[PDB]
Amino acid sequence: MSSETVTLYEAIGGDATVRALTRRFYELMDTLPEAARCRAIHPADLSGSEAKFYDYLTGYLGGPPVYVEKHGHPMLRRRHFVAPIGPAERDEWLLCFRRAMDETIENAKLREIIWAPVERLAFHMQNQE
């Protein structure tokens, strides 16, 4: 929606915010020693991962459906099956996503709206242990 209601994308500040969110996420993943397990299973060059997550989040939050346009149906559990994701990879991903959100999305109510379903998805991507 845009006029009396608005989308989450609109609400958090749209493209500049999703850009900052996704950038800060991979930065924390690359620089925090506590995120080393999650970092270990990602590609040595994070550039392509960032592009895809940014496109995924853009569509997911009510912005333009750019991820689907390029890659088709998300099918995330299947796409994540190629990485070995145990509790550690899972909680370290959630560590970085939480901190990236807290730092880039000012509105607490919008962070709560986004977080609960993402944390559900993360537990659902876990494929080990």
Please tell me whether residue 43 binds ligand HEM under the rule CB under 6 A: yes
What HEC string does the chain produce?
A: CECCCECHHHHHCHHHHHHHHHHHHHHHHHHCHHHHHHHHCCCCCCHHHHHHHHHHHHHHCCCCCHHHHHHCCCCHHHHHCCCCCCHHHHHHHHHHHHHHHHHHCCCHHHHHHHHHHHHHHHHHHCCCC
Contact with ligand HEM (CB under 6 A) among 25, 80, 96, 104 = 80
From 5-13, 21-29, 50-58, 101-109, give the range in contact with ligand HEM by CB under 6 A. 50-58
Is residue 127 a contact point for ligand HEM (CB under 6 A)? Answer: no
Out of 32, 68, 110, 125, point to the residue binding ligand HEM (CB under 6 A): 125
Burial 86-110, CB ≥16 within 10 A → b, else e: eebbbbbbbbbbbebbeebbeeeeb
Q: Is 6 in the site for ligand HEM (CB under 6 A)?
A: no
Q: Is 29 in the site for ligand HEM (CB under 6 A)?
A: no
Of the residues 35, 90, 96, 101, which one makes contact with ligand HEM according to CB under 6 A: 90
List residues near ligand HEM by CB under 6 A.
38, 41-43, 48-49, 52-53, 56, 71, 76, 79-80, 83, 85, 89-90, 93, 118, 121-122, 125-126
Binding residue ranges: 49, 52, 67, 80
